[PDB]
Amino acid sequence: IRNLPWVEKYRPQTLNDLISHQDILSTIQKFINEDRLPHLLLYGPPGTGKTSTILACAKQLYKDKEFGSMVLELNASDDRGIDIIRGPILSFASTRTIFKKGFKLVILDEADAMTQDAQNALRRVIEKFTENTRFCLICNYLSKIIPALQSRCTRFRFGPLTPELMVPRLEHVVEEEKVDISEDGMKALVTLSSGDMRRALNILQSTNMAFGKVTEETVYTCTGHPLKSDIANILDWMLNQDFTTAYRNITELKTLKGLALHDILTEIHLFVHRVDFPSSVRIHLLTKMADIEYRLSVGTNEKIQLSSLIAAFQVTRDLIVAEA
Amino acid sequence: IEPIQSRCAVLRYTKLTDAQILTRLMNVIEKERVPYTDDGLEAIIFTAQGDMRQALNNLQSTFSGFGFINSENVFKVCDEPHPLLVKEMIQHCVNANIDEAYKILAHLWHLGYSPEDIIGNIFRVCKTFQMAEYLKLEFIKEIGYTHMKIAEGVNSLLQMAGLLARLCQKTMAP
Amino acid sequence: KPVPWVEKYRPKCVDEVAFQEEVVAVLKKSLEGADLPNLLFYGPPGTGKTSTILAAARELFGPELFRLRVLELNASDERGIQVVREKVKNFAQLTVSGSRSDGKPCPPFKIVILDEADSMTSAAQAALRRTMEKESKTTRFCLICNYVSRIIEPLTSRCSKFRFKPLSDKIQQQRLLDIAKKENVKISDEGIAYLVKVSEGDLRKAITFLQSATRLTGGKEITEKVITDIAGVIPAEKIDGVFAACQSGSFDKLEAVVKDLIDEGHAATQLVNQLHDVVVENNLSDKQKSIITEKLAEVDKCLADGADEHLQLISLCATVMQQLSQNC
Amino acid sequence: TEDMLWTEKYQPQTASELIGNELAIKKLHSWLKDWKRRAELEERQNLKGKEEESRLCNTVLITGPTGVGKTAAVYACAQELGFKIFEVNASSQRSGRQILSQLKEATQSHQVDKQGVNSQKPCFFNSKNATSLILFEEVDVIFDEDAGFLNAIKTFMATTKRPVILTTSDPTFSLMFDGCFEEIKFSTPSLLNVASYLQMICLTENFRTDVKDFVTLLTANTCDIRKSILYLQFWIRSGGGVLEERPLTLLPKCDSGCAETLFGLKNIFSPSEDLFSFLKHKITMKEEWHKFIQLLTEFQMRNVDFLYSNLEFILPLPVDTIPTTAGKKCSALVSHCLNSLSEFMDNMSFLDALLTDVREQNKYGRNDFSWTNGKVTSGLCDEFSLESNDGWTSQSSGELKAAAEALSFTKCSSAISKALETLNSCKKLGRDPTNDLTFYVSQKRNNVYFSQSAANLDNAWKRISVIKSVFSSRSLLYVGNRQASIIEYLPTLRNICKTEKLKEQGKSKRRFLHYFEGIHLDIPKETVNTLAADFP
Amino acid sequence: SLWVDKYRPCSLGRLDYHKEQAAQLRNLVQCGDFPHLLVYGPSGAGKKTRIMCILRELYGVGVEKLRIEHQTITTPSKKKIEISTIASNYHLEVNPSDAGNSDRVVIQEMLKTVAQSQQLETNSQRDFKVVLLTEVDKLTKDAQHALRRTMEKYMSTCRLILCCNSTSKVIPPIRSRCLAVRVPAPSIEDICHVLSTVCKKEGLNLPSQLAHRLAEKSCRNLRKALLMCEACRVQQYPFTADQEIPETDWEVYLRETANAIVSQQTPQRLLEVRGRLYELLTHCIPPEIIMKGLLSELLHNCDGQLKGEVAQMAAYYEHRLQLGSKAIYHLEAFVAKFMALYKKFMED
Amino acid sequence: QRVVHVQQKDDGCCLWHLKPPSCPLLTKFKELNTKVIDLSKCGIALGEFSTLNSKLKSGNSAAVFMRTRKEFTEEVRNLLLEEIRWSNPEFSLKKYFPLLLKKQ
Ligand SMILES: Nc1ncnc2c1ncn2[C@@H]1O[C@H](COP(=O)(O)OP(=O)(O)OP(O)(O)=S)[C@@H](O)[C@H]1O
Ligand SMILES: Nc1ncnc2c1ncn2[C@@H]1O[C@H](COP(=O)(O)OP(=O)(O)OP(O)(O)=S)[C@@H](O)[C@H]1O
Ligand SMILES: Nc1ncnc2c1ncn2[C@@H]1O[C@H](COP(=O)(O)OP(=O)(O)OP(O)(O)=S)[C@@H](O)[C@H]1O
Ligand SMILES: Nc1ncnc2c1ncn2[C@@H]1O[C@H](COP(=O)(O)OP(=O)(O)O)[C@@H](O)[C@H]1O
Ligand SMILES: [Mg+2]
Ligand SMILES: [Mg+2]
Ligand SMILES: [Mg+2]
């Protein structure tokens, strides 16, 4: 039949259905209702609600029949370069609809994939046709947009959703969907989402179809994430066993779980600050693990880097034992 | 291309010193009767790294949003990593306080700022930070090495924590 | 006109993939429903991942429709992900007709096999996620990797994950003996055992080395020497000489042994691999093992950057000699 | 009250007015004089009526670097010898049908007006007797709209009766072009000749300038004559750099300080400030640190290391031009100075290896000092690069490298100075360690203010040329390895040439001179003499 | 030509040493499934001689009919790079690392073109055309990935022979697709036998002692031993048992450089060694070879315990030399740090 | 489409069922308070993050040229020509400077 995603189904069709950003939403609505909408630069991590904000804004400005003629949406990753800025964008910005008098809107999603010369022409297109059309650029990294293009727009950082405000809407969609989750399930959802409502709804939905129960273990075996017990046992093997036993056990667990060394370093880094270590031991472990993670970027043997990771803890194991 | 450059006199424009940006900013302020503070002027000048268009855009956006020029309103308008947090993190790295420095760094990471933005703000604050010459040199060396790693593709909280641990090791080692 | 024995002797059909029970079972129940979900095969190299996905493709499709309606790309392309995005967009937009004379119609979707999917960075993985959620019904993806943890959460959440376990050495020796009996080459069981040992559980490398040795030997028996020098593996005599030079404490004979290893054409990464395997599986102390393995990782990283073999090997042997003579 | 650029105001109207490339100028002038003689003899044969030995090819080709004077020499020779230039630039649509059907008749037919103001040389576009002469300017620039242009100029080779001159700056164009033409090479002119030429044009404008500043400018823009002329026009007509009177006999003021204006260092520094005095004095102020970081950043955008290239002069150490408590205090100064110098060099190695460069080096060719790189030509199409580039990294890495280099230099300079003020105690002891603390610099790095490279690039290019000419002989042309060639074949060739020269100087048999002919090697005798000299 | 280029073997039965390896290379082409080769070993061991022998055994004698072509290739940044290529009617030969970071570019288009060449040329001799990639160990990671893609794409139409000296930089994806041919250096007896075989064809009778001296002083380099024999033939007509072998000019230059380093440890001597290394680098001598010779002669003049520290320092700065674009900086970093260590060591 | 995770469990490996470690280091977990200073409480002064100063220079810049370069007299002109000829003894100064004088 039809099982649509919960990301699409639970979409903020109106500007009042966003949950986290309220200062910039009030600012954007005040830009809407006094007819002073500027060029916008909505930037931030994915799943924060930039496309939803601009789509609700365009629904507030234009109607259904004139949506296909007054607002033009592009993805810069589909065709980069000035073959699209000088082309559809320039002709859209310079023409006028026959009977519909007002201002047009250009929604340039994924603007950071645009090349430097295409941005150098898009800024001029923005400057020359400000009254006829407004431009809203949606991007993830502000560092991949030239400052000349940034300065023509008003920036809006859509920060990751804090768990204290992300949990109520997650509980609302849990109650609406009638899903049997536990509190560790919500904790794992808001831990692996990392301020991403699309990721949260996708992981929760996929876990629900995969198991029917959404606990910590079902979430962690649904998204293919390293378990907390696995990383704790790896830390125990580095902290208590000798070199060869730890090497054998960690290699066997890596083969058994499909586990790389980059993600082992990622989880062990978070375990380093939680575990009560001295300052010198913590500094040494962080430095050694950062070097091991950098050495894995270029093509190197993962066995030798794993032995180096065990060595990084065996350097300070006897020091902690003798320190007591 | 070089044949075109051979037929033209090339004139190099350099970044505007902050005194010139301040003079133009006070010219704009006195011609618009905008209330301000020296805190806000320093914040606007920090946010515009030798870019007068960025300085004027930040000033106009701050007055359009709140009408008062102070660092709270300026850094609410621009939404960068605040230089006070970066200053406290670098100060904790100077005192080899890895826990508090990582607390600041993890707070910035959970606020969602990109690693490039964090390392740029770290370099900008440490460039004007009050410290010894040799310690500043080792700090800038580790910042540049970490930034090279960020540019090469490896960017994570592990890399920034390793940078902070290296900065603490610079203080703990002669 | 002849094909390599890796391509010639892979299983034609599903349930001919030995030592994989649950993966074959879910692939069979996907064949029965004629719908293939998004797949993610992770396991050691040479363990039957490409064989299983290709067998599913040939048995879901026709023998003449198998190569036309699947696309095998390598995800480690050096020109970013956007070029691979262009290939997936072109293959999704391009449509071909399908008709089977066996009485079963073709599925409406298509198969994109993205190999070494773990080598893609998280930004490239997030960029690919848009393509696979924008072409979900008309295109299905199978990501082939070795580490499921390198695949990001939005991808791994929407994929069906399968783990491939490596075959035992007895099974690999049996398959290699069957291959050698099929291709009519004189080889004992000892040479096949040494081949399986020198491949380290890699059946693809074992079959490649066997075919290459049959081509090189010209119809004679496969000795241990041809297998040793066709796999690039340094013999254990040179490794024992390196360790004896390190334990002796004389730098001149250390230089002599290193220069002898360099003169024989042996690689330095292979020597670092053999030295690591010797060090981590012996009776050295934990401090000695830690320092030696850290230096081995640093030397391996330096060799990967393009540094000279002789200087890195001399430095590593100096470190190993100092650590072994620290007990003296 | 002047409306002319200084390139065309001071354009050479005579072939003797051009600077440098006298052999190429003489070759082109002789070729055009022979063509003019052939035209006048044709006119005399027409008046009377109503070629291996000559070997006068119908076409010359002229190649060299940009701005050296190929077009200027062509125009001066054609003006002197009375030719009329029909110019085909890349700035007009020149496809094969148009160039043939609109300029073949200039070669094939007489000039309808042979006397008057026809000595003016026009161009070609399509939106005393004067002999016609075609000039294809910048033949390496081929567009897609110039379809069949190569076939058209090949037809111009085949069916012309008036001379054709080709101007190009691509060094490898003469390889891929098939045909018969006299090849003329324009080499880069010497520093001092162009420096005196620019001093001449400045002295015509009532300005006094020093040779060293012009030499710095010319070695900055690599002897591009037109570029230096135009920047000189901009700098002179805007009032000059700095009022400083230099009394020299070897009276008006001198006007040194043009090179610092060229690199844009005067937009950072005050007019009272001097770059050498700024770098020599100890910096403490925040504004001084900003100025140093901005200066170093402006030099890192060019991927040029300013401090290390001029390391001897900027350091507080003695510089010479190339022609027991007392013992513990003599040794400790040198040990501390060597320690600080080694620390600074380790810092520079750190910045070169483990810090990102804003311009990705060895992009189109390999690293420096290699004869295998080939030729890199600019784009000939109207399509953009369309590849992903990171602008934030290029914005931040220059400031990072500049700040780290400035801090490394300040630490090193402070360490060497805090070693150096205690040299007065050693001087009072009667022992002089300054002969060990000195720096010996070459004359090439001493006649300029500041250098962008610390090596002898002329010696490097001479070595590159002799390496190319050794391994371009037909016997050595098929050697598979290249660095192994210059590491194994070439030293043995140098030893063989040295032994052959020793045999020749010993009055031995002349057959030993034919040893390279005995093994049938085709190395030119100038190269054999070059290899036989020494290994410097 | 010289004996290194005239008396070079062309058939697989003419190779004096490595007779079992030459026989295996002879039966390699008989099956008709000739794969990509990875011919690696030390310099001058006999690699390129064996590639020419295999190429002669594959095609006819027309592989010896050689010519040189120049190809201009457009980079994706819209720039043109011109490269040289040894070519014949059946094979190709190129050094793709001559284009710097754009080696991948001359990796792609060039093999693409030669594939189309084999699509156009028909002679019913062999299905493929062999292209010889020289110095594959100097290729960047992007270049090696593009090479992997190109070998997987155009396998049926063209074949590849990768001649390198170091498989460490060569990525494991490349090594898993080409048959490995390890060519170790000839021994002292092998070099002496080849030298006597070559010298007999000139009508000259060199002694065994001179041949042993040439074999010992060449460090198992057959090309260098033959060329030193050429220099000895140039120097004297009869081959005395105590005939002086002429040493390499840059080698004695590096020797004098290292004595200059050891003798005085001052900033002035550091700048003198700076000038010496600049003048060595202007002669296109690779910085790895300079570093190896410098380290060898410094370890000649070092003490027992200092040898390991000096060697680790030299390997560190050689890796940094490979990392940096300006190798001179890391060369003088190693020289200055060694001078500081030497001055510290002799003070107590 | 429905997702599933298949991990072929082997009970003999004994790494599938892993318990939390009993060592005191991994039992007692250190707590970070996640408390940071408020950002509008301290404030920023002038010149804290830049090279700004309270004193601004005046009269040391904006100096208009307004230069009147007088024509060089004949004797000074030959003196400067002789100076350039002494600087470059191999150059042909006498055959270029009158021609450039005619060019002006
Ligand atoms: N503030 C929010 N409140 C409620 N739901 C949200 C919010 N932000 C995101 N979502 C959910 O996330 C889904 C997709 O979010 P999008 O706004 O499309 O992501 P995005 O902001 O476009 O990020 P990128 O960079 O474009 S991938 C929506 O359909 C919602 O279900
Ligand atoms: N379980 C298995 N059943 C049957 N054949 C197998 C099995 N495991 C490995 N093989 C054989 O091993 C060879 C290589 O396996 P492939 O599946 O083709 O490659 P692979 O496992 O994907 O390794 P990669 O691609 O390098 S990660 C083929 O000849 C397969 O037939
Ligand atoms: N050798 C020279 N002597 C005198 N003036 C010169 C000389 N070289 C260049 N110029 C001046 O520079 C101007 C332009 O030089 P051109 O001859 O056009 O350069 P070019 O050799 O054609 O190289 P191109 O065309 O830019 S690639 C001339 O009009 C002269 O004013
Ligand atoms: N088997 C052999 N018999 C006689 N001469 C040989 C033999 N092998 C190599 N040579 C000579 O030694 C030289 C080998 O150089 P080459 O193999 O091209 O160096 P590289 O191995 O670095 O490519 C050739 O010039 C050849 O004349
Ligand atoms: Mg979106
Ligand atoms: Mg596969
Ligand atoms: Mg010209």
Numbering used by the authors:
A (entry chain C): 17 to 340
B (entry chain B): 178 to 351
C (entry chain D): 36 to 363
D (entry chain A): 1049 to 1098, 1119 to 1195, 1296 to 1418, 1451 to 1523, 1632 to 1844
E (entry chain E): 2 to 349
F (entry chain A): 868 to 971
Sentences from the paper on this structure:
Humans have three different proliferating cell nuclear antigen (PCNA) clamp-loading complexes: RFC and CTF18-RFC load PCNA onto DNA, but ATAD5-RFC can only unload PCNA from DNA. The eukaryotic DNA clamp is PCNA, a trimeric ring structure that encircles and slides along double-stranded DNA to promote processive DNA synthesis. We show here that ATAD5 has two unique locking loops that appear to tie the complex into a rigid structure, and together with a domain that plugs the DNA-binding chamber, prevent conformation changes required for DNA binding, likely explaining why ATAD5-RFC is exclusively a PCNA unloader. We obtained four cryo-EM structures of the ATAD5-RFC–PCNA complex (intermediates states 1–3 and 3′), in which PCNA is in different configurations that affect the ring opening and closing process during PCNA unloading or during dissociation of ATAD5-RFC from PCNA after unloading.
To assemble in vitro a complex of ATAD5-RFC bound to PCNA encircling dsDNA, we mixed purified ATAD5-RFC complex with PCNA that was preassembled with a 38-base-pair (bp) dsDNA in the presence of 1 mM ATPγS, a slowly hydrolyzable ATP analog, and incubated the mixture for 20 min. Two-dimensional (2D) and three-dimensional (3D) classifications resulted in an EM map at an overall resolution of 3.0 Å. We found that four subunits (ATAD5, RFC2, RFC5 and RFC4, that is, subunits A–D) each bound an ATPγS, and RFC3 (subunit E) bound ADP. The structure is devoid of DNA, suggesting that, in our reaction, PCNA unloading by ATAD5-RFC was complete upon 20-min incubation, and PCNA returned to the closed planar ring in the complex (herein referred to as planar-PCNA intermediate state 1). Indeed, we obtained a similar 3D structure to planar-PCNA intermediate state 1 by directly incubating ATAD5-RFC with free PCNA. Therefore, we propose that the closed planar-PCNA state represents a late intermediate stage in the unloading process in which ATAD5-RFC has unloaded the PCNA from DNA, and the PCNA ring has closed and is ready to dissociate from ATAD5-RFC, as explained later. In the planar-PCNA intermediate state 1, the interface is smaller (2,059 Å2): the aromatic residue Phe115 of the PIP box also inserts into the PIP-box binding cleft of PCNA-2, and Arg112 in the PIP motif forms a single H-bond with the main chain oxygen of Lys254 in PCNA-2. The RFC5 N-terminal α-helix and the α1-extension-helix move up and lose contact with PCNA-2. In the planar-PCNA intermediate state 1, the interactions involving PCNA-1 remain the same, but the N terminus of RFC5 and the shorter α-helix lose contact with PCNA-2, and no subunit is in contact with PCNA-3. As the most prevalent conformer, especially after a 20-min reaction, the planar-PCNA intermediate state 1 might be the most stable of the intermediate states.
